[PDB]
């Protein structure tokens, strides 16, 4: 937090080889970038493609299903929406299913 400029980079970049041994130095970047790029590419490939051409619904249902099962009681917003939908649906159903088809 003073300046550094690169000192830190060098040191660390050095201690990493002197500690982790140069025997398997590229093994770290290789492994990480291995599953990192594979997954990243796979996600974007299945999220920036059919996810908009055909798979534009599945993802929506998945995120919605989890959001509901995760917000069912983990947020005031939902409670408000459900409360309004319940009272509105119930009230209307009471004045409709019990105040319409019964008269005339």
Description:
The protein is mainly alpha-helical and 104 residues long. The chain folds into 2 domains: 1-45, no CATH class; 57-104, no CATH class. 70% of the residues lie in helices and 0% in strands. It contains 5 helices and no strands. It has helices at 7-20, 26-45, 50-53, 58-71, 76-96.
Q: Total number of helical segments? A: 5
Rg estimate, integer Å: 28 Å
| Shape designation | elongated
Number of domains: 2
Secondary-structure element pattern, one letter each: HHHHH
Distance between the termini: 82 Å
How would you sum up the major sheet? none
PDB class: transport protein
Keywords: transport protein
Assembly: monomeric
Entry title: Solution structure of the E. coli TatB protein in DPC micelles
Write the layout of secondary structure elements.
Layout: H1 7-20, H2 26-45, H3 50-53, H4 58-71, H5 76-96
Provide a quick synopsis of the model.
The protein has helices spanning 7-20, 26-45, 50-53, 58-71, 76-96.
From the structure above, extract its key features:
2 domains; mainly alpha; elongated; 104 residues; 70% helix
């Amino acid at each position: 937090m003073f300046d550094i400029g690169f000192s830190e980079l060098l040191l660390v970049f050095i201690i990493g080889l002197v500690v982790l041994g140069p025997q398997r130095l590229p093994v770290a970047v290789k492994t990480v970038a291995g599953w990192i790029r594979a997954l990243r590419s796979l996600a974007t490939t299945v999220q920036n493609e059919l996810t908009q051409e055909l798979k534009l619904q599945e993802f929506q249902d998945s995120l919605k299903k989890v959001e509901k099962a995760s917000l069912t009681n983990l947020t005031p917003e939902l409670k408000a929406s459900m409360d309004e939908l319940r009272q509105a649906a119930e009230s209307m159903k009471r004045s409709y299913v019990a105040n319409d088809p019964l008269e005339h």
